[PDB]
Design a protein around this ligand. Sequence first.
Ligand code: GX4
Length: 130
Amino acid sequence: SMQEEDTFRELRIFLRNVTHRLAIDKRFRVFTKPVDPDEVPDYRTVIKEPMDLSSVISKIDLHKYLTVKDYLRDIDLICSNALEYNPDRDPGDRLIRHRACALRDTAYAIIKEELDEDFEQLCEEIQESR
Ligand SMILES: O=C(C1CC1)N1CCN(c2ccc(F)cc2)CC1
């Protein structure tokens, strides 16, 4: 229906706004663009599904997310990729992991305060119905 297409448009507006707030935070700069294969040729052989905040913006616009749960699977994949690729005790690795965990916890906290649970339940029921 028209009403269902209006529900999914509101979902996209909400997701662009959360993603822009993460992307301007100086802590999360390393997560804003894909890894350059020239700089890190080993990256694409270790990490099977790369993900970053520029790709998440592109996926919102392509209508890839029908629920906030779909969207948070990609935020969780940005975080898990960083913990897998950078697992060592040295400071460079410990700083990337700390920032990855902060990206994940910040996205979950914005959504806890600002997403209405009945708006998410509506998105999930339209998705199920298709
Ligand atoms: O996991 C990531 C970020 C996507 C989250 N990276 C770890 C490895 N970094 C790197 C850069 C130059 C270099 F010569 C070797 C490694 C780039 C940043």
